[PDB]
Amino acid sequence: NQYIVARPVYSTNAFEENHKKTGRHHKTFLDHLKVCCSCSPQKAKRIVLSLFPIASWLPAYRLKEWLLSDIVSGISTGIVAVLQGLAFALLVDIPPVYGLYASFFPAIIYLFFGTSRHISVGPFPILSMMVGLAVSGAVSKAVPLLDDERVRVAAAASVTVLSGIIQLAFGILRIGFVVIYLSESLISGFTTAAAVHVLVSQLKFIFQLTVPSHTDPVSIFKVLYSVFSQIEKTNIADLVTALIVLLVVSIVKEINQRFKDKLPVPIPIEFIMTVIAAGVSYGCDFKNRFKVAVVGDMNPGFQPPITPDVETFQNTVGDCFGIAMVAFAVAFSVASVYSLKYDYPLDGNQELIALGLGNIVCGVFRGFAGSTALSRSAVQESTGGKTQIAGLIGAIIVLIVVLAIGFLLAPLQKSVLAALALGNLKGMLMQFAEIGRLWRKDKYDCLIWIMTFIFTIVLGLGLGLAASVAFQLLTIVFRTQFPKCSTLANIGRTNIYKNKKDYYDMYEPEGVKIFRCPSPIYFANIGFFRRKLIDAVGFSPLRILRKRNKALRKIRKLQKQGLLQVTPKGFICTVDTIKDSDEELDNNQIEVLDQPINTTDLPFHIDWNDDLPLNIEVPKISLHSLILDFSAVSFLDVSSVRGLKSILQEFIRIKVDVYIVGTDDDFIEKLNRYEFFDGEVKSSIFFLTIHDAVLHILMKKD
Amino acid sequence: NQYIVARPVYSTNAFEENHKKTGRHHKTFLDHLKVCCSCSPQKAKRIVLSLFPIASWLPAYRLKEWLLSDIVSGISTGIVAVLQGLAFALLVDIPPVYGLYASFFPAIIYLFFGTSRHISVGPFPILSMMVGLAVSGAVSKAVPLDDERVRVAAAASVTVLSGIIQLAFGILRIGFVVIYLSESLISGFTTAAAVHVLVSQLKFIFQLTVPSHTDPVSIFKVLYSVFSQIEKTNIADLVTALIVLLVVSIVKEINQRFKDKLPVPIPIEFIMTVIAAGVSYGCDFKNRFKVAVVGDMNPGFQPPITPDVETFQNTVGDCFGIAMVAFAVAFSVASVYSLKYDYPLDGNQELIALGLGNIVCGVFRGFAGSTALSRSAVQESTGGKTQIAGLIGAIIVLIVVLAIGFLLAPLQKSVLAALALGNLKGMLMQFAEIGRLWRKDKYDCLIWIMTFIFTIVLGLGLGLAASVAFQLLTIVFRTQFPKCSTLANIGRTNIYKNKKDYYDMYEPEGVKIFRCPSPIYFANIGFFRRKLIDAVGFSPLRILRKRNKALRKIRKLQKQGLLQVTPKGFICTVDTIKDSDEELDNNQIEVLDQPINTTDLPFHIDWNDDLPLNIEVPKISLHSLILDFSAVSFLDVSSVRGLKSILQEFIRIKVDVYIVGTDDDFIEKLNRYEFFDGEVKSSIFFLTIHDAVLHILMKKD
Known part of the structure; x- marks a missing residue:
C-alpha cells in the first residue's frame, strides 16, 4: 500500500509543453445564437410538445x-x-x-x-x-x-x-x-x-x-x-x-x-x-x-x-x-x-x-x-x-x-x-x-x-x-470574509503539506513560506488576504523596497561625492562615521522609493541582507521564496487581481520569488484575460503543486 | 529535476493516527468576552490614545x-x-x-x-x-x-x-x-x-x-x-x-x-x-x-x-x-x-x-x-x-x-x-x-x-x-453553474487533469473522478447533483429503485417456490414467468429507496450480472467515485443535505465514495453538520486523488 511516484518537476508551462493539449473549439455566443434559430422539423415538434405537455x-x-x-x-x-x-x-x-x-x-x-x-x-x-x-x-x-x-x-x-x-x-x-x-x-x-x-x-x-x-x-x-x-x-x-x-x-x-x-x-x-x-x-x-x-x-x-x-x-x-x-x-x-x-x-x-x-x-x-x-x-x-x-x-x-x-x-x-x-x-x-x-x-x-x-x-x-x-x-460574503489563512509545512519528508500549527515534527525549508487562503479571493477579502500574508511572511515587501531605495539613494549620494569608492570587491570607505542626513523627500518626490531597484550601473551586486557600510541600516529578511497555495481559491474578480498583482510585484522587486500552485487550467486562462501577466509577473510562477514549487526552489538554491 | 516520493497510501484518518496533532484549544466567544473586559492599566492608555489621536x-x-x-x-x-x-x-x-x-x-x-x-x-x-x-x-x-x-x-x-x-x-x-x-x-x-x-x-x-x-x-x-x-x-x-x-x-x-x-x-x-x-x-x-x-x-x-x-x-x-x-x-x-x-x-x-x-x-x-x-x-x-x-x-x-x-x-x-x-x-x-x-x-x-x-x-x-x-x-452568478469536470490520469503518475483537455489520458476502470471547482451551497447544489449524474452516466437512485423492484420480483417467485434458492445460483424449476409488475401504490412506492438487504438469500446477487427469469436491471460499471473537493471552500446546510443524499444513494448501490483534497478544517465543520453516520463514514476522506486511486486499485486486486 505504497504511494510511489517518480516524475519530473513541473511548472504549469512545462506540463503544457511536455503534454500536447487537445484543441477544442470556441463555444461562441454567435454560433450558439445560430443553434437558437434551429427551425428544424423535429426541433419545432419538440418545442410544441414541451409547451403543451398534455399532448x-x-x-x-x-x-x-x-x-x-x-x-x-x-x-x-x-x-x-x-x-x-x-x-x-x-x-x-x-x-x-x-x-x-x-x-x-x-x-x-x-x-x-x-x-x-x-x-x-x-x-x-x-x-x-x-x-x-x-x-x-x-x-x-x-x-x-x-x-x-x-x-x-x-x-x-x-x-x-x-x-x-x-x-x-x-x-x-x-x-x-x-x-x-x-x-x-x-x-x-x-x-x-x-x-x-x-x-x-x-x-x-x-x-x-x-x-x-x-x-x-x-x-x-x-x-x-x-x-x-x-x-x-x-x-x-x-x-x-x-x-x-x-x-x-x-x-x-x-x-x-x-x-x-x-x-x-x-x-x-x-x-x-x-x-x-x-x-x-x-x-x-x-x-x-x-x-x-x-x-x-x-x-x-x-x-x-x-x-x-x-x-x-x-x-x-x-x-x-x-x-x-x-x-x-x-x-x-x-x-x-x-x-x-x-x-x-x-x-x-x-x-x-x-x-x-x-x-x-x-x-x-x-x-x-x-x-x-x-x-x-x-x-x-x-x-x-x-x-x-x-x-x-x-x-x-x-x-x-x-x-x-x-x-x-x-x-x-x-x-x-x-x-x-x-x-x-x-x-x-x-x-x-x-x-x-x-x-x-x-x-x-x-x-x-x-x-x-x-x-x-x-x-x-x-x-x-x-x-x-x-x-x-x-x-455568503460573511462566510468568505475573514478566511482562516494559514502557513503550511512539510510533514513526513514527503509531498504532504499541512497547517504549520497542527502537527509535531513538521519542517519548513529554509527561506520558503507556504501560504494558504481557503476561499475565493475577491473585493470583500483582498485586504484581509494582503494583511494575513504580510503577517505570515513577517514583514511588508513594500516597506522593504522603500527602505532599500532610500539606502541606495544614500549610497549613490555618498559615492558620487567621492566619500566612498566602488570596486568589484564592494564599497570602500576611506571615510567612516558619516554624518546622518535623511533626504526627507517631499510629497511630489516620495514616489521614487516604490520603483524597482536598478543597480546595474554599479559594478558589483549588493547583498541587501549583508552589512551595508557607513551606518546604513536596512531590515534583513530570510525569505527568498514564497509559495501561494491557490488550490481552494475558486475565483478571482478584478479587484482581487489588481490587489494580487500589486502584492506580487512588490515581493518580486525585493527579489523574493513567488509561486502560485494548486490551480486548475481554467483559472489560469481567466487570469490571462485580466492582463495579469507581463514582464515582471510571468506565467512561470505557476506550478502544479506545492512540492513541485518547493523542489524547484531547492534545486535553484542548491 | 525529479519529483520522487515514496510514502504509504494515506486516508485522512490514517494520516492523523500516524501524526501527532498538536492539541489546540479554540478561543471560544466566552473567553474573547473576558479578555475584552480586561481593564488592564496599559490597555486603558491605549484606548484613550486611540480615541484622541492628537495626543x-x-x-x-x-x-x-x-x-x-x-x-x-x-x-x-x-x-x-x-x-x-x-x-x-x-x-x-x-x-x-x-x-x-x-x-x-x-x-x-x-x-x-x-x-x-x-x-x-x-x-x-x-x-x-x-x-x-x-x-x-x-x-x-x-x-x-x-x-x-x-x-x-x-x-x-x-x-x-x-x-x-x-x-x-x-x-x-x-x-x-x-x-x-x-x-x-x-x-x-x-x-x-x-x-x-x-x-x-x-x-x-x-x-x-x-x-x-x-x-x-x-x-x-x-x-x-x-x-x-x-x-x-x-x-x-x-x-x-x-x-x-x-x-x-x-x-x-x-x-x-x-x-x-x-x-x-x-x-x-x-x-x-x-x-x-x-x-x-x-x-x-x-x-x-x-x-x-x-x-x-x-x-x-x-x-x-x-x-x-x-x-x-x-x-x-x-x-x-x-x-x-x-x-x-x-x-x-x-x-x-x-x-x-x-x-x-x-x-x-x-x-x-x-x-x-x-x-x-x-x-x-x-x-x-x-x-x-x-x-x-x-x-x-x-x-x-x-x-x-x-x-x-x-x-x-x-x-x-x-x-x-x-x-x-x-x-x-x-x-x-x-x-x-x-x-x-x-x-x-x-x-x-x-x-x-x-x-x-x-x-x-x-x-x-x-x-x-x-x-x-x-x-x-x-x-x-x-x-x-x-x-x-x-457572486451567486459566478458560482451558480460551476464548470464541473471529469478527471483522468495523464502520465502514469499522480497528476490528474481534465479528461477532455489532453491526449493519452487514462481513467482507471470502474473509477470516476469528479471535480466541482467552487464552493457548494444552496444556489448550486442542484446543479452539482445534475452534473454528477451526467458524469457518472446514470442516476444512483434509479438504479437502486430498479434493483429493489428486481429483488421484490425475485422474492415473489421464491415464496411461490418457482425459484428455488441454491448456494450456487438462481436455478428456476419453471421458466414460464408471465409479464406482470407489482404497481405499488403511492403510499408503498417509497419501499424502493431502502437499502438492499439480501442476507435472507444464501448467495450474493451480482446486480451487474444477469438475473433469473429475465429480470432486467440496468448494469453499472462504476464501483468507485472520487470527488475532488479541493476547490470546494465551504458547504452550507442545504448542500450538506444534498451531498449526504447523493452519497447515500451511491453507497446503497455499492459504489464506494471517496472525497479527496480537503483540509482538516473542512472535515471538522462537516462533523458539526452530523454528516457522518453508519453508512457515510470518515474513512471516505483521503488526502489526494492518487491516494484514493491506489487504495481503489489494491482493494480491487
Missing part, C-alpha cells in the same frame, strides 16, 4: 392502472379544494365564491400546460394573505358596503392578472432557475413567520371581530391589537365551534398519519366536520340563535370576464412580483417533492408558463392568485393521484359546487373555515425546532432563519422576503 | 520639517475649501455661508479625533447632492426666507442623524463595511453621481429656476426643467461659466504635467474667482447683466440649533445612505495617502471622528461632509504633512466667515458652478472602465453598468442600495 402524457395514459385511482383522488382533493377556496377567499377579504373561481380556473389551465402530475393547483394561505395585502394597498392608493367589496374584488383580479403576467414572462425568458436563490433556511423561516401571519389573520373569524384592513409594516401587530382591543365582544358560539373543529381535525389528521397502513383511504375529516357544522348550524338556526357569521348566499354561476385596471397594476407592481415569486417557489418545491418521489422530469420554465397562464385566466374571470397548497397536493397524492386527471376531477367538483350545490354551503360558519386553516397551519408552525438545529450545525444558516423570520414578521410578507433574500446573499 | 502625533511634531509646509498647504487648501463650501451649499439649496460653516467644523473635530494626516475634511459634491435631496423630501413630508429657514433647519438635522449613525458604527467597531463596495461598484456609482452633479449645475450656469425634484429620476426632471426654459438663459452667466470652466481646465493640466517642475501648483481657482469678483464688481454685472451673485452673508456664526425629530423620522434612510457614502469616500481617499506615506489608518476612529464632526456641524447649522478628493489632492500636493494643514484651512474659513466674507458678495453663482464642474473630469472619464471591464471580467462590467443605471434612475441613495444588492448577486 404527451394523455395518449400514454394507463386506463386500467390509473383511472379509478385518479377518480377517487380527484373527488377527495376537490372536496378539500372547495372548502380551502372558501377559507382563502376569507383571507383575501372578498366574498367566498371567488375562492371557488380560484380553485377552478388555474387547475383547468394547468391540466393543459403543466408538467407536474401530483400537485393540486389553487390558492394557499400565504398567497391569499399576500394578495389581500396587495389589494388593501391598491384600494388605499386608488385615486378618488357592497361597493367596497366590489372594489376589493376588482383589485384582487387585477393583482392576479399582473402576477400571472410576471410569471408567464419569467417562463418565456427561461428564468425558471430563480428558485435556487431561496435556501432551505430562508424558506423555513419565511414559511414559519407566514404561518404565524396566517394564524393571526384567522383570529377575526374565530372570535368574530371587525378588524380593519391593515397594511405593512407590522400589520400582524396592528392586527393583534385590533383583535384583543375588542376581545370583550368575542362571539362565544364562533369560538366554541372553531375550537371543537380544530381539536377533532387535529386528532384525526394524526390518526391519519399514524395509521396510514390500516386505512385504505385517509379519513376525510374536513369534509365530515364541514357537513356536521353546517347541519347543526342550519337545524339549530345558529345564525339567529347565537348571531354567528355564516358563509351566506352565493351567486350561482361564474362572473363575466373583467378588464384589468392599469391603475391597480401601477399601484401593485411590487406586490404582484412578490406574489409571483412566492407562488412559483412554493409550487416548485411541492412539485419537486413528487417528481423525485415518482421519478419524472419537472420543467421549471413550463411550471412558470402554466402558473402564469392559470393566474391570468383566473384573474380575468374574477379569481385570486394561487399556485399550490402543500396540504391539498398531499390529499390528492395520498388518495391515489397518478396524473392531473385528478386535478380535472377536482375542478369538476368545484364547478358542480359553483353551479348547482353552492346553496348547501350557506349556513356554514366562517369560524369553521378558520379552524380548518389553522389545522393545516400546524405543520408549518412546527418548524420552530429548526432554530436549535441550525445553531449547532451552521450559524450562518441559523442567522438566515432568524433574520428571515424577523423580516417577515416585522416587515411585510413581500418586503420581508425581499429583505430576507438580500441578507441571505450577504451571509 | 500621539502632536507631541511628535517635527517643527523644522513640517511647519512651513503645513502652513503653505493649509492656506492653499483653505482658499480652495471656502469656494468649494460656497458651491456645495448651492448644491444643497441653502444660503452659501452655511457652506462656510460646513467647511469649518468637521475639519476642527477631525484635527483631534482623526487618524488621517492628509485628507481635507468638509463637503464634496456627491454628499451635498445627497443631503439636498434629503431635505427636499423632508420639507415635502412635514405635517404643518421661510423656505430658506426651513431648508437650513432640515440640512442640520439630516447631518446630525448621519453623524450619529457614523458615530454608532465606529463605536460598535463595524469599520469594515467599506469592504462591501467593490472597485467597479464605486466606479459606476461615482461616474453616475458625476453625471448627477453635472445636471445639477445647469440651473446655475444658465440661471434658471428649477423645482426641488426628488428621486426617482430626478436627474431627468431637472434636465427637462432646464431645457424647457433654455430660452431664458442669461448669456453673461453662461459666457462667464464657460470662460471660467475653460481656463481652469487648462491650468490644471499644466499643474499635472509640469508638476515636478512647478514649485507649487498654480492656484487657478483663487485667481479666477478674484478676477471674476473684480470684473463683476467694477462693471456691476448684477445690474448691467442681471447676473446671479453670492450676495451679502451675515458676518459671523449662527447660534446652536436642536435637531428636528420630525426631520429625523422622515429622513432616516437618506441619512444612512449619506453616512455610508461619506465614510466610503473619506476612507478611500485616506487610504491612498496612508499607503502612499506608510502610516496606519483606523476606520473605526474615522467613523467616530467623521461622526462627531458632522454632529457639531449639524448642531451649528452646517451640512454633512467628509472629504473632497480635489481639495485633499490640493492639500497633499502642496506639502501637507500633518492635519495642521487642516487646522490652517479651517482658520482661513474662519477668517472668511467673520471679517472678509463681504468680498464674496459680487461673485456669481455661475462661477461657483463652473468650478464644481471643472472638478468633474476625473470622475467623468471613468466611462473608459466599461471597455476594460468587458475585456477582463464581465461580472464586474455588469456591476459597473448596473450601478450606473441604478444611480441615474433611482438616485444617489437608492441607487447605491440596489447596487450593493446586485453586487452581492453577481
